[PDB]
């Protein structure tokens, strides 16, 4: 996240973190005791027996007890094209049940095809690249939805009047509008916080049938 | 619509000196990782070089290191492979990669790969 802002400690306690050799390398949010979402393109060619899914993180360079970390069991993918950049969404189950507490919740999704106009206010967060290395501490960023320069398979934002966006690290991160899941960190253009190019988002609402069929 | 064209294979004597180039037509999509993979027939895939997006980190394979430097380009979306010293063991499919994921240059999780160009090194 550029240009962002320190989270509050367990503010967004749904919020996952991906990890690789010990490394956060993507964000993911909790959507059932034993399911995450993610962006496709974070698992794509990676062994996902290695990946570690880390919930009721604040700090990643801190050792923390409020953590929860989980193992991925199986991967659930609906037409992810990388070409086309299409459907980057990816549902990996757990291979146990999360302890549901102050520190790890379960996120709340939007209905079936609901889509979010222009202006519309979200909150954008991640442990991805300040602009400055990986973020250490959870950061947030006040974003808005913008329907020119994005397809009808995105949800694209972008912060008004300054040089802020996700970067590299925050894909698989949740996008929060009026409190529900509403996107899925996929693709920035023209390199972090051009003030050219929307960030795109994985259009959540387009997959809740999907998605509740899997986590019921 | 995301694309890989790959330029300057060919020929060269041991001992040779070869540029090759990448660009990603259009600014469709910003790619956090590029880099180089080799192919000799009937051989696995080989990680050769890569790149951050910000050039700030580079990697190389310890049998290509100080006779190649990779080098990239985000104005004009491109990465080159300068590759100095060429020994026959080189002649390989060069192909060029880029991924999204901020994973190390060497992990081979690359998504998007080039149809690769031929380099030759004579003996």
């Known amino acids: 996240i550029v240009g962002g802002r320190r989270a509050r400690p367990h503010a967004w306690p749904f919020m996952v973190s991906l990890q690789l050799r010990g490394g956060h390398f993507c964000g993911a949010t909790l959507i059932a005791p034993n399911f995450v979402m993610s962006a496709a393109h974070c698992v794509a060619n990676v062994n996902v027996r290695a990946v570690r899914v880390v919930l009721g993180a604040h700090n990643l360079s801190r050792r923390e007890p409020t953590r929860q970390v989980f193992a991925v069991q199986r991967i659930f993918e609906n037409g992810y094209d990388p070409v086309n950049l299409l459907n980057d969404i990816v549902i990996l189950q757990l291979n146990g049940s999360a302890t549901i507490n102050a520190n790890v919740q379960v996120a709340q999704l939007p209905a079936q095809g609901r889509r979010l106009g222009n202006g519309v206010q979200c909150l954008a967060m991640g442990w991805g690249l300040l602009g400055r290395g990986i973020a250490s501490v959870l950061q947030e960023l006040n974003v808005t939805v913008v329907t020119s320069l994005c397809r009808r398979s995105n949800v694209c934002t972008l912060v008004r009047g300054r040089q802020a966006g996700v970067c590299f690290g925050d894909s698989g991160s949740p996008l929060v509008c009026n409190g529900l899941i509403h996107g899925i960190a996929s693709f920035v253009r023209g390199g972090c916080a051009s003030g050219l190019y929307p960030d795109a988002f994985a259009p959540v609402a387009q997959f809740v049938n999907w998605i509740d069929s899997i986590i019921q | 619509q995301v694309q890989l064209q790959e330029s300057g294979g060919g020929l060269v004597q041991a001992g040779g000196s070869l540029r090759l180039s990448c660009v990603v037509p259009g600014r469709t999509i910003s790619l956090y990782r590029m880099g180089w993979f080799r192919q000799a027939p009937g051989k696995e895939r080989e990680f050769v070089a890569g790149?951050?997006?910000?050039?700030?980190?580079?990697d190389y394979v310890d049998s290509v290191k100080g006779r190649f430097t990779i080098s990239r380009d985000n104005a004009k979306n491109t990465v080159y492979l300068e590759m100095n010293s060429l020994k026959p063991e080189d002649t390989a499919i060069y192909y060029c990669?880029?991924?999204?994921?901020?994973?190390?240059?060497?992990?081979?999780?690359?998504?998007?790969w080039g149809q690769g160009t031929q380099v030759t090194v004579s003996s």
């Open positions: 790149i951050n997006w910000s050039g700030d980190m580079t």
């Open positions: 990669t880029a991924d999204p994921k901020l994973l190390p240059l060497a992990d081979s999780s690359y998504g998007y």
